[PDB]
Amino acid sequence: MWFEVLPGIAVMGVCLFIPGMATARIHRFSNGGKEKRVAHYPYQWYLMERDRRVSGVNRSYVSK
Amino acid sequence: XXXXXXXXXXXXXXXXXXXXXXXXXXXXXXXXXXXXXXXXXXXXXXXXXXXXXXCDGGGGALGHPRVYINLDKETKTGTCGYCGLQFRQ
Amino acid sequence: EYVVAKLDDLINWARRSSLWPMTFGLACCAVEMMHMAAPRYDMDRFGVVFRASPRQSDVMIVAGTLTNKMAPALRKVYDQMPEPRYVVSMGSCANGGGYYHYSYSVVRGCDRIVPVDIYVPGCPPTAEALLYGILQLQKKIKREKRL
Amino acid sequence: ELLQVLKRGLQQVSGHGGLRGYLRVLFRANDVRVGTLVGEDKYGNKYYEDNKQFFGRHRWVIYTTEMNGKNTFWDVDGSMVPPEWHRWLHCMTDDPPTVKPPTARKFIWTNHKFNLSGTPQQYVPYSTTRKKIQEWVP
Amino acid sequence: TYKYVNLREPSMDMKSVTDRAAQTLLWTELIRGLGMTLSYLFREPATINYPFEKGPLSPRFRGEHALRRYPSGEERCIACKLCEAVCPAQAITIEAEPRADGSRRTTRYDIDMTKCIYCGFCQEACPVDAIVEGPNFEFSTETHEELLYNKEKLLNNGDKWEAEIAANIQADYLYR
Amino acid sequence: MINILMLIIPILLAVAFLTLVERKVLGYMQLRKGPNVVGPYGLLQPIADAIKLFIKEPLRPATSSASMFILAPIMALGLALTMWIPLPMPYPLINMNLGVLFMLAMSSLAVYSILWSGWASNSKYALIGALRAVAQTISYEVTLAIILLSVLLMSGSFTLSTLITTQEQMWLILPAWPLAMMWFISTLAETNRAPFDLTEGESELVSGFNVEYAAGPFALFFMAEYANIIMMNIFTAILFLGTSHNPHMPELYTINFTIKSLLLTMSFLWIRASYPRFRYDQLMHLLWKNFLPLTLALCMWHVSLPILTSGIP
Numbered sequence: 001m002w003f004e005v006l007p008g009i010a011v012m013g014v015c016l017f018i019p020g021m022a023t024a025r026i027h028r029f030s031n032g033g034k035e036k037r038v039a040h041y042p043y044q045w046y047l048m049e050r051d052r053r054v055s056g057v058n059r060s061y062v063s064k
Numbered sequence: 065x066x067x068x069x070x071x072x073x074x075x076x077x078x079x080x081x082x083x084x085x086x087x088x089x090x091x092x093x094x095x096x097x098x099x100x101x102x103x104x105x106x107x108x109x110x111x112x113x114x115x116x117x118x119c120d121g122g123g124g125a126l127g128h129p130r131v132y133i134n135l136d137k138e139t140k141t142g143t144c145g146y147c148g149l150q151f152r153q
Numbered sequence: 154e155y156v157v158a159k160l161d162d163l164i165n166w167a168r169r170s171s172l173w174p175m176t177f178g179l180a181c182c183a184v185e186m187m188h189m190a191a192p193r194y195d196m197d198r199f200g201v202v203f204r205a206s207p208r209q210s211d212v213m214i215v216a217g218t219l220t221n222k223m224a225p226a227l228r229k230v231y232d233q234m235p236e237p238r239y240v241v242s243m244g245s246c247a248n249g250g251g252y253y254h255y256s257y258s259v260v261r262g263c264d265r266i267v268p269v270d271i272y273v274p275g276c277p278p279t280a281e282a283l284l285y286g287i288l289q290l291q292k293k294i295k296r297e298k299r300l
Numbered sequence: 301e302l303l304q305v306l307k308r309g310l311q312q313v314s315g316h317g318g319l320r321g322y323l324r325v326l327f328r329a330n331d332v333r334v335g336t337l338v339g340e341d342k343y344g345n346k347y348y349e350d351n352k353q354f355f356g357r358h359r360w361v362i363y364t365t366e367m368n369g370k371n372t373f374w375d376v377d378g379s380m381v382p383p384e385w386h387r388w389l390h391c392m393t394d395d396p397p398t399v400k401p402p403t404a405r406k407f408i409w410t411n412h413k414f415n416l417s418g419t420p421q422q423y424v425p426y427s428t429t430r431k432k433i434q435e436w437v438p
Numbered sequence: 439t440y441k442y443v444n445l446r447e448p449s450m451d452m453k454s455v456t457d458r459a460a461q462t463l464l465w466t467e468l469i470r471g472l473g474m475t476l477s478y479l480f481r482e483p484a485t486i487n488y489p490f491e492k493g494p495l496s497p498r499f500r501g502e503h504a505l506r507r508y509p510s511g512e513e514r515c516i517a518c519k520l521c522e523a524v525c526p527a528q529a530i531t532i533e534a535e536p537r538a539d540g541s542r543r544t545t546r547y548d549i550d551m552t553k554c555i556y557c558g559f560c561q562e563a564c565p566v567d568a569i570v571e572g573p574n575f576e577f578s579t580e581t582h583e584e585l586l587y588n589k590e591k592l593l594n595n596g597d598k599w600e601a602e603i604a605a606n607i608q609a610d611y612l613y614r
Numbered sequence: 615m616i617n618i619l620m621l622i623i624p625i626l627l628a629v630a631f632l633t634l635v636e637r638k639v640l641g642y643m644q645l646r647k648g649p650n651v652v653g654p655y656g657l658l659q660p661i662a663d664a665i666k667l668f669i670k671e672p673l674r675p676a677t678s679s680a681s682m683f684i685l686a687p688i689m690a691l692g693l694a695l696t697m698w699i700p701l702p703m704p705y706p707l708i709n710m711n712l713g714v715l716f717m718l719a720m721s722s723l724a725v726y727s728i729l730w731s732g733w734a735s736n737s738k739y740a741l742i743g744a745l746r747a748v749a750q751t752i753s754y755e756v757t758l759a760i761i762l763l764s765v766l767l768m769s770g771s772f773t774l775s776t777l778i779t780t781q782e783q784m785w786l787i788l789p790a791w792p793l794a795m796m797w798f799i800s801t802l803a804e805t806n807r808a809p810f811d812l813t814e815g816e817s818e819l820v821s822g823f824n825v826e827y828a829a830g831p832f833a834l835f836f837m838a839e840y841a842n843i844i845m846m847n848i849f850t851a852i853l854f855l856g857t858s859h860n861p862h863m864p865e866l867y868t869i870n871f872t873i874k875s876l877l878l879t880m881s882f883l884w885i886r887a888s889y890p891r892f893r894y895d896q897l898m899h900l901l902w903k904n905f906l907p908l909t910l911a912l913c914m915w916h917v918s919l920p921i922l923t924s925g926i927p
């Protein structure tokens with residue numbers, strides 16, 4: 001029977017589901033617009049540095 | 065019958081003023097119900113017509129080998145080897 | 154007062170939940186000990202998981218005849234067990250020799266070497282009767298640490 | 301095929317007990333199943349039977365809460381159920397209170413007892429013979 | 439008769455070689471072996487949980503020892519030392535004295551569970567059918583002293599199993 | 615930082631709830647009932663083991679070693695749980711300058727857990743299980759990097775973020791047909807619950823990194839060894855699976871990503887029950903002798919393909 005097997009899968013559909021949603025939904029409180037900027041190479045890093053310098057002041061990433 | 069200590073079953077003394085028996089104190093000692101052969105004489109004696117009658121517990125099904133008992137002494141009760149069943153006449 | 158009394162039962166609930174046996178391949182009793190892993194009469198994740206190694210396990214099941222050649226061997230295995238340990242001597246050999254007993258080599262009853270908490274009397278220890286050896290074990294764990 | 305399988309599970313929960321009854325057969329009982337019941341037993345055992353399922357299986361049966369004086373609903377053992385183990389559950393086909401008659405003796409114990417093991421009032425060893433008597437007189 | 443385990447090479451030419459090479463290059467037969475336990479997962483398990491469900495048995499079965507009695511009282515055991523001699527473990531001990539007046543049945547009767555291999559020998563050797571083996575399973579003790587049976591008493595307390603014994607012995611007389 | 619703490623505690627629970635699946639799915643594979651008594655379906659048993667093995671179980675080895683031994687379960691968890699950080703997911707925790715390089719380096723560093731457990735006991739009985747664990751891992755580290763390189767040259771660079779975007783229409787299983795079959799075997803390089811596996815399970819020899827360890831260190835080893843199985847299952851679901859991306863809705867990705875990984879999570883325990891151990895000598899002959907010329911031929915093939923038809927990130 002699978003009625004015993006499926007609760008073993010459903011309990012995994014909660015705990016393994018957490019790390020995906022917890023990383024994404026935390027971007028609401030950390031940043032204004034639910035997005036964390038990708039760094040990779042200095043070109044994209046410089047755009048973040050000038051954004052924080054230009055009238056955002058304290059905030060790292062902010063629109064206008 | 066019991067005196068001070070636990071009740072005796074099938075004639076067995078416990079201890080004289082408690083010396084040997086000490087282990088049976090925390091745990092309760094066992095006792096068999098009707099072990100003094102009180103049920104042996106409780107069964108009524110059967111009447112017979114023949115000089116000798118064969119005894120059985122309950123046919124061939126229950127464990128009783130066939131024993132012939134003579135009922136001619138009159139004064140004697142007349143009982144088989146396996147049972148305490150008494151026979152007269 | 155009440156939280157302290159219930160916390161001790163919570164620690165004892167872990168031993169009530171699961172206990173790992175030792176695969177003592179000592180005699181014919183060990184074959185019926187393999188029948189505990191057999192599906193028809195199972196304790197597999199009912200409260201028993203076979204893994205071996207005396208260092209990891211909680212319960213050791215002495216499954217058969219012990220001799221003078223085996224008396225030093227089994228003793229230190231029991232010493233290799235973690236301190237909350239339970240010994241289940243299963244079978245007439247484990248209780249004092251099936252026949253034997255008056256023999257030269259066989260040590261009588263395991264209790265001469267290692268202390269036993271739960272006894273199973275069955276030669277061919279029927280899996281039905283074997284299930285008590287783990288269920289009564291969990292029932293015997295009642296109270297630990299008052300002060 | 302798929303619709304009948306989900307309906308079979310819902311009917312099993314609805315038949316036996318209800319909402320509070322289904323939880324008692326899930327938390328305390330390992331496997332939940334509904335069918336026919338024998339009913340009549342000493343202390344208060346349920347004793348269920350007449351189920352197909354698999355070979356060598358005769359339904360849930362279930363153990364009674366507080367049989368003699370243990371007072372346990374979560375803890376259960378094979379000490380439960382009166383002199384009736386030779387039928388329904390194993391060996392015999394006829395039911396102990398329905399078809400198969402229990403033999404009277406007027407010597408057998410009326411109230412069934414559970415094995416104590418660790419609890420007081422348990423098994424004990426005892427001496428039998430009066431041995432060689434010794435006497436000393438002043 | 440000779441069955442022969444050797445196949446003597448199934449591959450020969452073109453068609454018989456390439457399919458035998460295909461299973462060794464990738465897998466195929468291992469995926470076929472993977473599908474063998476797939477169907478085994480789909481079918482229901484034949485499992486019995488003990489505290490509620492019970493396993494199959496027989497009308498004649500041996501467990502813990504219990505001695506029987508006659509329908510109108512009285513001890514069925516006659517004291518022979520018969521069952522003592524048959525016993526390969528010598529677990530059963532018997533010493534007898536006359537019971538008050540008339541009947542002569544037992545004084546010492548210990549069956550040690552430290553020994554006893556469970557033969558059914560003492561069940562068969564007994565002419566009066568005193569020791570009749572019941573379908574017992576539950577026996578677990580703290581000490582050896584609690585395990586081994588005393589002078590009848592606990593063996594006499596087989597009355598709780600004697601109701602099953604009477605049903606089992608009905609299959610015993612005129613054997614099966 | 616809250617994200618790291620929200621990726622250890624629910625992840626340790628996933629390794630805890632694995633113990634159910636380790637004998638439920640494996641149980642039904644062997645036609646036997648697994649977890650049943652403890653919870654509603656034995657769901658209270660995985661959390662019971664944490665109360666069982668840590669609070670009450672006390673052992674420390676006899677002859678032992680000095681600081682090392684107890685250093686090894688710290689090395690077990692503190693190098694295998696860190697592997698969760700470079701994972702791309704819907705969104706990664708500190709997206710690496712090069713992704714898979716950190717994944718390959720820390721996996722080889724995670725092997726040291728079974729290596730330092732050899733010197734846990736000074737006695738020679740434990741180190742035989744360690745020496746066997748060397749060769750059962752050392753050879754398979756060769757192909758693990760090579761088969762990666764053939765996939766990485768096919769799609770993007772080392773960055774794990776680009777590996778999600780590259781699979782928009784079809785999976786990478788179909789172009790890398792023999793290479794995908796290799797990653798059911800090469801993933802089992804680390805001491806995992808499998809048929810190929812390494813010197814960790816009992817069966818023939820004594821249990822490696824378990825005979826020396828207690829319960830408390832030994833319990834900490836399982837929380838790391840079974841954690842690597844999920845890690846390889848997710849990593850295969852990035853390199854070979856993808857289906858869809860969707861940056862606007864993270865909800866549609868999170869459900870779809872888990873189902874793909876869970877089907878692979880069952881597949882390793884499917885392998886474990888089905889087949890016997892490959893032997894110390896003959897596992898060294900499966901790869902190196904037989905599989906290494908095959909993987910390099912496909913590596914040769916995957917070098918030419920971006921030159922034959924344009925395929926450069």
Ligand SMILES: NC(=O)c1ccc[n+]([C@@H]2O[C@H](COP(=O)([O-])OP(=O)(O)OC[C@H]3O[C@@H](n4cnc5c(N)ncnc54)[C@H](OP(=O)(O)O)[C@@H]3O)[C@@H](O)[C@H]2O)c1
């Ligand atoms: N240092 C030495 O070696 C030394 C030197 C000179 C003389 N001595 C003498 O030799 C003896 C050595 O004994 P020990 O110290 O080895 O014994 P111990 O380890 O203290 O063990 C005594 C046991 O009795 C129980 N117990 C004692 N008092 C109790 C109370 N008030 N309530 C409940 N349980 C109680 C304890 O149980 P719980 O743990 O469950 O409470 C404990 O397990 C001493 O009595 C001392 O006079 C010793």
Ligand code: SF4
Binds near residue numbers: 246275276278
């Ligand atoms: S008690 Fe019986 S089954 Fe067990 S080892 Fe001894 S002879 Fe074999």
Ligand code: SF4
Binds near residue numbers: 514516532
């Ligand atoms: S049990 Fe049977 S054979 Fe043994 S002494 Fe009693 S009557 Fe005789």
Ligand code: SF4
Binds near residue numbers: 526527529549553556
């Ligand atoms: S079953 Fe065998 S070993 Fe046990 S008491 Fe009877 S004759 Fe002796």
Ligand SMILES: [Zn+2]
Binds near residue numbers: 121146
């Ligand atoms: Zn008679």
